[PDB]
Amino acid sequence: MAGPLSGLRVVELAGIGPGPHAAMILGDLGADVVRIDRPSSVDGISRDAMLRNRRIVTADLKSDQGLELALKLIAKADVLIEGYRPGVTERLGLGPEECAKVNDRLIYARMTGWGQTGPRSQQAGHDINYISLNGILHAIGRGDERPVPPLNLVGDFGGGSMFLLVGILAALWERQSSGKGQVVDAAMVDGSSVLIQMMWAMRATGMWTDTRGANMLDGGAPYYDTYECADGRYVAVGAIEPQFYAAMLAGLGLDAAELPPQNDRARWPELRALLTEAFASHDRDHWGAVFANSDACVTPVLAFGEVHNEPHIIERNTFYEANGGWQPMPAPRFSRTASSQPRPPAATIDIEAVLTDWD
Amino acid sequence: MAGPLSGLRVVELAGIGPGPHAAMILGDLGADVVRIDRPSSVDGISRDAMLRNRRIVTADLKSDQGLELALKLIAKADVLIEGYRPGVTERLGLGPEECAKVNDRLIYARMTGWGQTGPRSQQAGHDINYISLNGILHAIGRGDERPVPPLNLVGDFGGGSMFLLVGILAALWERQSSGKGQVVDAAMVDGSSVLIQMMWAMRATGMWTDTRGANMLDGGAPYYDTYECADGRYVAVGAIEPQFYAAMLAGLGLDAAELPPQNDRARWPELRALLTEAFASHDRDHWGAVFANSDACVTPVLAFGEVHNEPHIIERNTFYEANGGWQPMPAPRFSRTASSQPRPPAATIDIEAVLTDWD
Numbered sequence A, B: 001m002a003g004p005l006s007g008l009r010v011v012e013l014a015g016i017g018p019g020p021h022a023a024m025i026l027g028d029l030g031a032d033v034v035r036i037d038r039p040s041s042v043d044g045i046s047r048d049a050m051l052r053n054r055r056i057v058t059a060d061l062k063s064d065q066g067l068e069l070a071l072k073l074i075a076k077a078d079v080l081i082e083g084y085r086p087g088v089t090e091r092l093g094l095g096p097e098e099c100a101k102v103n104d105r106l107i108y109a110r111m112t113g114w115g116q117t118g119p120r121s122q123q124a125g126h127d128i129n130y131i132s133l134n135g136i137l138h139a140i141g142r143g144d145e146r147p148v149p150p151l152n153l154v155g156d157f158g159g160g161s162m163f164l165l166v167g168i169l170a171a172l173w174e175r176q177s178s179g180k181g182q183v184v185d186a187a188m189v190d191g192s193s194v195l196i197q198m199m200w201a202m203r204a205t206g207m208w209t210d211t212r213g214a215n216m217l218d219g220g221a222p223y224y225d226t227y228e229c230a231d232g233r234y235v236a237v238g239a240i241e242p243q244f245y246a247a248m249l250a251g252l253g254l255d256a257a258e259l260p261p262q263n264d265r266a267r268w269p270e271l272r273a274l275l276t277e278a279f280a281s282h283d284r285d286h287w288g289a290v291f292a293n294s295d296a297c298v299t300p301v302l303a304f305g306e307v308h309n310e311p312h313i314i315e316r317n318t319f320y321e322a323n324g325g326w327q328p329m330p331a332p333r334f335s336r337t338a339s340s341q342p343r344p345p346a347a348t349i350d351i352e353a354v355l356t357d358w359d
């Protein structure tokens, strides 16, 4: 298996959202990922591409034999991922202490939204809920409107799977010197708060407010926002640095002297009206051409379906073709031990076969 | 130093955005992190709480002495982080090939937006630019408006620093076999694309469209969105699974028999109108009470300033106090080798004293 994580062994108890994503990236980077699902949900070659780079086995973990078969996998493995409510793995007899009996070296990786304990620890939830509680969701969207969910990118993946991964791999490093595994408690409400640490810093130095739509990076700044163009498509402007901002104005055809100052926030509505009129006067592709090779920080805002036609995307192979269409190639990239193209999710294999393979 | 990354030595060529955030987290988890800034841009004790868990040293890398002192630190370190345009470290004599000759165990971590090559590799940018090209930005916001940036959460941090961290830690794992370092190429356009792999999968199977504001997780679903309450504050609804949706309806006082089906998309306008009116009839804190300890997936949308009074946040110590402002505690959490409270920014230290300390 290609990638820096060649020979890492990972057992994934099938859940939803962050756990599968973390498991995927491990797979992507060449880890040996065995996913235990329940026989009831498994009907054919699973067609969720988030289950790439896996071997899928079924096993009723409530049966005596399914438990036993699972503890044998875990004994042969480096990392266990689970994404159930607290208590769940314990009652299956798959809890951290049961696992430590058969393998004191296991990285035991617990992926929740609310954490392992506390008043909300048994509440069901999705991304939108974890980010509502810690300030993040309130800060996203236009000021005159209700907050908008940034898909499930921030709680599940950014503040969720990714911290699970940082924990699994930091624990593996610690183990190199201690001989021992341990438990990683990755809570989305915690990870996403670290993910947004820059805002908490800026709030302390009076550089961020709790008003939605009134900040440098939330869409409130005329030089950090999207603009609608003549064809109804959009560009993104991110010209924070004054030098980049100046280059943008020249390219728009605007004389900096007739404008309010870049950072005079009281005059932001006025500045925005002037930039809005300028961007609206040509189409998106025009601006893409005009600002190619510039530091103006102006880029076309592409829909998913257009991304495969963008030179910079094509030439770095950020995507590979599959199945219905494009999927992202592994990230990040490695000079010596390079990941390879993901393997699609294969037919269910039998859990004994896997045990043979790992003896 | 407390945490799983105790003993890891890290050299950070001072930059902005992802590279400092990645460096912060390594320090958060116990790494010994040394940040080389230019003297040009230092004055006293920093106020930027993203520079916690850090030693700061200054050094004109353009000079012969600076270059040589930098190369000494790098010789004695596990990891180098740089976030400059491609070619910068090469030109400065701190490129991968130059570092490899003084330390072939080094993990050489390159944090960019566009990548090390391709047509956009020299253009300036920020988060909004990198997520504009790979389809992400176009997918965020309401259907009747231009896209709204999800702060800088998706490109800088979730799709940036976090992939940098996974690459560093994956490469460190690999170095346990090989005895050799390597180059990690983390580009925000690639990282963020993997962060959104779910949507690429669902697009392939017809379960996600390119229309903004018309999908399950982008605000288009009445049961995954925010709602305005009587007091003008908001709740979040994430009641995807039918059993949780049912619990929400009961809490709202709506009988299922008077509503359209939860997933009859043609009648989402009606359903939204019904939920809207119901949520609008009481204030946020009413809903928060009703639905505490429930699986209804309804939570208050708190502002930064209110977070510190939420019971679940207090009890798990998701935050600590520091300099007239709360800040997030490290994530994730480790059972045996727990992180400690971050150390605030300190005054600059002499680069010699660091070399001495490190031998």
Ligand SMILES: CCCCCCCC(=O)SCCNC(=O)CCNC(=O)[C@H](O)C(C)(C)COP(=O)(O)OP(=O)(O)OC[C@H]1O[C@@H](n2cnc3c(N)ncnc32)[C@H](O)[C@@H]1OP(=O)(O)O
Pocket: A013, A014, A015, A016, A017, A018, A036, A037, A038, A039, A059, A060, A061, A062, A083, A084, A085, A088, A091, A092, A111, A112, A113, A114, A123, A124, A125, A126, A127, A128, A152, A156, B240
């Ligand atoms: C396609 C589009 C869908 C996209 C969804 C988006 C995802 C997001 O936005 S993140 C949301 C998920 N949140 C989390 O994962 C946080 C932690 N997890 C949870 O809170 C819960 O797992 C939750 C709410 C998601 C679902 O709750 P629920 O279905 O009650 O499951 P959970 O309580 O975890 O327990 C699962 C049960 O399956 C059982 N089980 C698990 N695997 C097996 C198996 N192989 N065989 C037999 N039983 C099994 C467990 O034993 C447990 O049973 P029990 O009734 O004894 O406790």
Ligand SMILES: CCCCCCCC(=O)SCCNC(=O)CCNC(=O)[C@H](O)C(C)(C)COP(=O)(O)OP(=O)(O)OC[C@H]1O[C@@H](n2cnc3c(N)ncnc32)[C@H](O)[C@@H]1OP(=O)(O)O
Pocket: A216, A240, B015, B016, B017, B018, B036, B037, B038, B039, B059, B060, B061, B062, B083, B084, B085, B088, B092, B111, B112, B113, B114, B123, B124, B125, B126, B127, B128, B152, B156
């Ligand atoms: C609140 C405000 C903060 C904003 C935060 C948000 C950030 C985001 O949303 S993403 C971050 C931006 N993008 C990236 O980091 C991607 C990669 N980086 C870049 O594209 C560039 O660094 C960029 C565009 C940020 C800045 O560009 P620019 O200032 O031209 O720097 P760049 O070309 O990288 O070169 C850095 C310069 O510093 C010099 N330098 C760096 N360290 C030193 C040193 N210690 N001593 C001497 N010289 C030094 C280099 O020599 C080089 O100068 P020159 O070209 O004159 O030799």
